[PDB]
């Protein structure tokens, strides 16, 4: 792939429907832990170990400690220069009748905090719950999410399981329900939301320029979205700290922290 910013900027000046696909690389630049690399653990586990219907079925306390930790950590995190350039570009182009859509694998809401309005959160959100009895999905920014979790969730190896009984984990507040809540986060082995997938398929079919930003952690189907666009002849620009297994299918590859490359690219 090319690293000609001048060539990318030519396409950028004319594009009417831009899809930006973001992965954890963009969150790591704001210091948000991801729990996925070689070496990236919470206690003795990684995200793929805890973000699973198996972990929740067998140890819902532990899975809640882990998402509690992640919610509380966000308290003190801010969107970075890459989130901002993406949000500013959306705003600016929309005044020109041009469309920018962000499809994000991230669940941390930093794009939303930066001002991105056209945001498809394909793996859900740290700050949503879903009731496992009635299925209602609700916003929840409470700190702590329930009292039994106050002080829990510490990441250090050695840390004991809180072992909170299911009755004192987060519970649905809908009148007449009382069911156990779960994070409204898509786990490994589960279906993505069919409504969101329809949007994603439609946006990808219309777009005339695709950006792929901080997607070194490979997850399906998201890792297929940009190859699908490139396979139609549409230019794809990858902004990442390293190459990925799909890099050789894209038109552009710009190496470096997204925070350094995006502000220039999207000016």
């Amino acid at each position: 792939p090319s690293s000609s910013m001048a060539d990318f900027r030519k396409f950028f000046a004319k594009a009417k429907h831009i899809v930006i696909i973001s992965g954890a690389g963009v969150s790591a630049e704001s210091g948000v832990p991801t729990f996925r690399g070689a070496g990236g653990y919470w206690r003795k586990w990684q995200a793929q170990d805890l973000a699973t219907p198996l972990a929740f079925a067998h140890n819902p306390s532990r899975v809640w400690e882990f998402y509690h930790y992640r919610r509380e950590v966000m308290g003190s995190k801010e969107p970075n220069a890459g989130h901002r350039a993406i949000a500013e570009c959306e705003t600016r182009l929309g005044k020109q009748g041009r469309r920018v859509v962000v499809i994000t694998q991230n669940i941390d809401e930093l794009h939303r905090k930066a001002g991105t309005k056209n945001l498809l959160e394909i793996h859900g959100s740290l700050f949503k719950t879903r009731c496992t009895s009635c299925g209602v999905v609700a916003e929840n920014y409470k700190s702590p999410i329930c009292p039994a979790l106050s002080g829990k969730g510490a990441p250090e190896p050695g840390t004991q399981d809180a072992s909170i009984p299911v009755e004192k984990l987060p519970r649905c507040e809908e009148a007449g329900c009382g069911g156990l809540l779960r994070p409204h986060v898509v786990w490994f082995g589960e279906n993505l939301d069919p409504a969101i997938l329809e949007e994603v398929d439609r946006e990808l079919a219309h777009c005339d320029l695709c950006l792929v930003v901080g997607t070194s952690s490979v997850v399906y189907p998201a890792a297929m979205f940009a190859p699908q666009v490139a396979a139609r002849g549409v230019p794809v620009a990858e902004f990442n700290t390293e190459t990925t297994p799909a890099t050789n299918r894209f038109r552009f590859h710009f190496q470096g922290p997204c925070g350094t490359t995006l502000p220039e690219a999207l000016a």
Binding site: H123, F188, N191, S217
Partner: peptide
């Protein structure tokens, strides 16, 4: 239906 699945081949 389309599932979330970890990429392993690399």
């Amino acid at each position: 239906e389309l599932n979330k699945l970890l990429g392993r081949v690399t």
